[PDB]
Design a binder for these strands. Structure first.
Ligand SMILES: [Mg+2]
Ligand SMILES: [Mg+2]
Ligand SMILES: [Mg+2]
Ligand SMILES: [Mg+2]
Ligand SMILES: [Mg+2]
Ligand SMILES: [Mg+2]
Ligand SMILES: [Mg+2]
Ligand SMILES: [Mg+2]
Ligand SMILES: [Mg+2]
Ligand SMILES: [Mg+2]
Ligand SMILES: [Mg+2]
Ligand SMILES: [Mg+2]
Ligand SMILES: [Mg+2]
Ligand SMILES: [Mg+2]
Ligand SMILES: [Mg+2]
Ligand SMILES: [Mg+2]
Ligand SMILES: [Mg+2]
Ligand SMILES: [Mg+2]
Ligand SMILES: [Mg+2]
Ligand SMILES: [Mg+2]
Ligand SMILES: [Mg+2]
Ligand SMILES: [Mg+2]
Ligand SMILES: [Mg+2]
Ligand SMILES: [Mg+2]
Ligand SMILES: [Mg+2]
Ligand SMILES: [Mg+2]
Ligand SMILES: [Mg+2]
Ligand SMILES: [Mg+2]
Ligand SMILES: [Mg+2]
Ligand SMILES: [Mg+2]
Ligand SMILES: [Mg+2]
Lengths: 129, 81, 150, 144
RNA sequence: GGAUAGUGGCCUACCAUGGUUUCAACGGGUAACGGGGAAUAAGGGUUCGAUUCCGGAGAGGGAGCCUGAGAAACGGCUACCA
RNA sequence: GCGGUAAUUCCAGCUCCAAUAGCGUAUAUUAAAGUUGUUGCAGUUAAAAAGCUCGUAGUUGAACUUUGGGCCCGGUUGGCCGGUCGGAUUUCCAACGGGGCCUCCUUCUGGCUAACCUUGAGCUUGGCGAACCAGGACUUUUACUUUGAAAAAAUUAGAGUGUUCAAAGCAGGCGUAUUGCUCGAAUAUAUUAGCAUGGAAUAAUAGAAUAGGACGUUUGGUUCUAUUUUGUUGGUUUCUAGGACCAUCGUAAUGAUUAAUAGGGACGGUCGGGGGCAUCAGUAUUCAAUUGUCAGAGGUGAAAUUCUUGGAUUUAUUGAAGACUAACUACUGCGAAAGCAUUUGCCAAGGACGUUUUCAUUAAUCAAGAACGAAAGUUAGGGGAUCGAAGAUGAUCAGAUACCGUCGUAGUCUUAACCAUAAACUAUGCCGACUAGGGAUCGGGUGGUGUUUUUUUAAUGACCCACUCGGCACCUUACGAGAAAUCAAAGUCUUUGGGUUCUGGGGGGAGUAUGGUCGCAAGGCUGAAACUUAAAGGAAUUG
């Protein structure tokens, strides 16, 4: 069955960016979806996105643009320590001057740099660049 | 393609889509208001009634179950509700 | 899907978006609960009760006409069956298919299909035991299955 | 899902799975079974001492036609019999008979070296006087 | 209850039938004393650690015991085995 | 690989080259090895998807519940002013997320009573307990992460510093060197477990559902404990003080998340060569009886074995046996796969569909354990018409114990019980998601004054058009993949992570040996090593 809505959502985002489109439909739009895209839109990778509220689970329609290169999920969500942030960012980022590693901490969802600015750690959700 | 308005699609396409795969799913079916011949005894019935519905006054027939919509009686009158 | 087959047919209801309904209704739920219980007094299950109200009368769902559900309506009035309606139907199919094999030794198709049915019976009894709707140490067996249906 | 489990609590599956497939390797097979201790006429060592029994006229594999001038040696520490090659031009004359020789492998790590069939050892010392020094006539073989 | 410097099936009498186990018991092998550490490694790792320090065991194999705060001691004793 | 009479490859001379007080060899081990693969392997064809399905353990598993508090800076939506004639602005009430700084918490018995309504004339006599404490009854439990203490020394990285440099070592350095002075001998790392501590996103866990549910300034009562005082110490008491329990009057918007293009189930109309049992038919084949007629007929590349004037073949008439189920029959149907086609009845089952019905996460995949599993085969019967492993012959041939011709037993058929294999192939495990166009078809459905037949005329049924859900498939192209062949899956993989099961690690020895285990047996399942050695293709290209 479906195990990660984030994997299905982000795969739909990539496959639309691979084919050149400006929009994609996201089902079923969990909380960690918006938090993941809310981080993404603050960095300008996606921009406007819309929540269609069906009474079942929700839907998301996203307006895309050619800025994004790849946005995926690392499963399972490993526990990453404040010293292990470096290893993740070197393995799964194209360079160390751009790109963000999205990882959930006790203080909400944030990138690998906002974690360093706040000096907090937690579990890893994914990556966008 | 590659630029489409998924927010507000045309209703003609929404009429074509299956009742599950549309923007927000909903029942294509409806409820009837069928006038029984003779006594008024106005009653309401499902479109896919799936049972041989009949009124209490003259319990002969109003409709017959079928694999699709319910076929109404030969002589009767109905008003869409 | 179709755990015990290869079918993938998505054929189901589509509940209306409007959680309040139907906007053309007759007298309110004070009479609906009275009609639901009287259909329950003659032995009809909530599936049958719901279908009858849905088509003969106009009831999109008893869940929007009344804040409660039909089974909970029946449960509150003390008419809940000893086993849930769904489990009673797996059991009776097992009893019917078991008797068929007692006449047909060589029907290996019935052998395959009886195995699948009892596994669904087991996965529901296990689930119903955790919920505590069914007592624990409750087991399905062929010896008492026939007496359990009726 | 690429095969292997990805669950955060499946380290037990991954470690046990790795144990079962590690046996398909050859070095891990010999090391843990201790075959070199139980087989491979040495005791897992690189050199062994034995007595020359006779000389051999082993002929060359394809494509090659030559005689290799090896010797049958019976080892001291375990009594096993091996065949060992006498490498140099005309060094079969220094290993005549009954001498107590030291042997070494060929560098193939347990298999035959060249077109010499079934020979996986070579002579490195005869009478403890460093055979190589004899070919270059630097030392003299002991009289007895 | 005995015994020990003491807790404790450590031993004894009676009583109950328990305790461990696919989350790998129990059994078998180890060319296994264990660690601090060593070699090689982008990162993850692999292999080794008899051996200068820490802990344990042994004085040819077992067993037993005197003295003494402290030994089941072995450059202490007694017996059997070799 | 060189060497079989011109060896740049042996043995030497000459010359040259690498490291150089060191260089080589043997074995082991490390990197190379993305050839162990958690990061990060491979499984259509090269090695490898168990024949298929079920399902305890294990792993994984839809969505849903308020955001310490302040102080500034700057953005996006709004908001009068439109003061420009339907375009934009600032001193603005708000929300949302960004950047920098400082960054209540469950109560009571008591104190400092504190921050003090405290104010005495412009420094005075009197506020509410954690801001500091002693005790009180309650306390939903976790995983995770931050920070802190502990993780001996040597060793590791590393600060300083004269062994003359360096490996080292922890020394040393500075003066009038007459009396002496002084810096050092750091620091870091140290997984996991335990302790203390902050956060509380993510992933679990529990509560209020025939309410024995909570607050309770209240009202009867039951029970227990207990200090200072009554004049002393004990034995009895009252209220008071403190638990606990029990019932109604008294308060609450009293208390159940969606209903997953998840799953189970229900219902209605269908559908299909799905299964089991009974029943029926067809022509054919063989045989047989009766009849006419004649001498050949059979077979083959050619023949021959063979049957024939006692009538072979052929014709005609009738009958029996056992098996099969043609043509219809196709890039069509059903089934987990193996498989399944004459007819009708009975029995049970099933996918898809439709559904404004029901339950509510029951789910995905699975060690151990199992159901079924073609053909051949085994045991015991029945049957034994066809064909027919062995065999007898006739050929063929140099041989022929083969291919071909004529016969021919076990079997083919069935009942009962075993066997567990197949190139059991899509050589493609299963579940879920998204990514390009096109037509055809099967089942169900939807709509359409569409066509036809009935009662010109209705309903139906059968066709037509458009669409849809599910299915067996096919066509085009590659933005994508691949090693190519090719592939809408074998794509979404160095931009490497959806879940999960199984299998593989050069070719052989070898599916052998051995030990278990199942079987009546044949054999199945499980399953090595010693030893051997650079040598066959998945794929394409040219000949
Ligand atoms: Mg589906
Ligand atoms: Mg996990
Ligand atoms: Mg005791
Ligand atoms: Mg005791
Ligand atoms: Mg040892
Ligand atoms: Mg020591
Ligand atoms: Mg000792
Ligand atoms: Mg000794
Ligand atoms: Mg001793
Ligand atoms: Mg001594
Ligand atoms: Mg092959
Ligand atoms: Mg293969
Ligand atoms: Mg297969
Ligand atoms: Mg689970
Ligand atoms: Mg913890
Ligand atoms: Mg649903
Ligand atoms: Mg039906
Ligand atoms: Mg059938
Ligand atoms: Mg005749
Ligand atoms: Mg057909
Ligand atoms: Mg037919
Ligand atoms: Mg499954
Ligand atoms: Mg096989
Ligand atoms: Mg296969
Ligand atoms: Mg798929
Ligand atoms: Mg179709
Ligand atoms: Mg089909
Ligand atoms: Mg290998
Ligand atoms: Mg191999
Ligand atoms: Mg070669
Ligand atoms: Mg080829």
């Amino acid at each position: 069955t479906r195990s990660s809505v984030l994997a299905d959502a982000l795969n739909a985002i990539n496959n639309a960016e691979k084919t050149g489109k400006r929009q994609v439909l996201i089902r079923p739009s969990s909380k960690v979806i918006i938090k993941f895209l809310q981080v993404m839109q603050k960095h300008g990778y996606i921009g406007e996105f819309e929540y269609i509220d069906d009474h079942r689970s929700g839907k998301i329609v996203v307006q895309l643009n050619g800025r994004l290169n790849k946005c995926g999920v690392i499963s399972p969500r490993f526990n990453v320590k404040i010293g292990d942030i470096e290893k993740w960012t070197a393995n799964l980022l194209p360079a160390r001057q751009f790109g963000y590693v999205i990882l959930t901490t006790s203080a909400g969802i944030m990138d690998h740099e906002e974690a360093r600015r706040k000096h907090v750690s937690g579990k890893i959700l994914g990556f966008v660049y | 393609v590659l630029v489409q308005d998924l927010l507000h699609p045309t209703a003609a396409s929404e009429a074509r889509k299956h009742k599950l795969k549309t923007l927000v799913q909903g029942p294509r079916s409806y409820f009837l208001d069928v006038k029984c011949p003779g006594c008024l005894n106005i009653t309401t019935v499902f479109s896919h009634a799936q049972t041989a519905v009949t009124c209490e006054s003259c319990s002969t027939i109003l409709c017959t179950p079928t694999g699709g919509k319910a076929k109404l009686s030969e002589g009767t009158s109905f008003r869409r509700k | 899907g179709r755990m015990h087959s290869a079918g993938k047919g998505i054929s189901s209801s589509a509940i209306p978006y409007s959680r309040n309904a139907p906007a053309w209704f007759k007298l309110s739920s004070e009479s609906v609960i009275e009609q639901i219980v009287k259909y329950a007094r003659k032995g009809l299950t909530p599936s049958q009760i719901g279908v009858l109200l849905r088509d003969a009368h106009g009831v999109t769902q008893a869940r929007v006409i009344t804040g409660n559900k039909i089974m909970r309506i029946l449960k509150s009035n003390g008419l809940a069956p000893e086993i849930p309606e769904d489990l009673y139907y797996l059991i009776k199919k097992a009893v019917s298919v078991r008797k068929h094999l007692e006449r047909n030794r060589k029907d290996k198709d019935a052998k395959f299909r009886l195995i699948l049915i009892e596994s669904r019976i087991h996965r529901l009894a296990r689930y119903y035991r955790t919920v505590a709707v069914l007592p624990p140490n409750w087991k399905y067996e062929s010896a008492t299955a026939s007496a359990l249906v009726n | 899902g690429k095969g292997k489990p990805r669950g955060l609590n499946s380290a037990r599956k991954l470690r046990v799975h790795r144990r079962n497939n590690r046996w398909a390797e050859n070095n891990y097979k010999k090391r843990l079974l201790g075959t070199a201790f139980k087989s491979s006429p040495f005791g897992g060592s690189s050199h062994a001492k034995g007595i020359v029994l006779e000389k051999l006229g082993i002929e060359s594999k394809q494509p090659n036609s030559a005689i290799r001038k090896c010797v049958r040696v019976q080892l001291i520490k375990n009594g096993k019999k091996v065949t060992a090659f006498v490498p140099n031009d005309g060094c079969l004359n220094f290993v005549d008979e009954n001498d107590e020789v030291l042997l070494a492998g060929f560098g193939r790590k347990g298999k035959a070296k060249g077109d010499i069939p079934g020979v996986r050892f070579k002579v490195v010392k005869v009478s403890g006087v460093s055979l190589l020094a004899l070919w270059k006539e630097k030392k003299e073989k002991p009289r007895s």
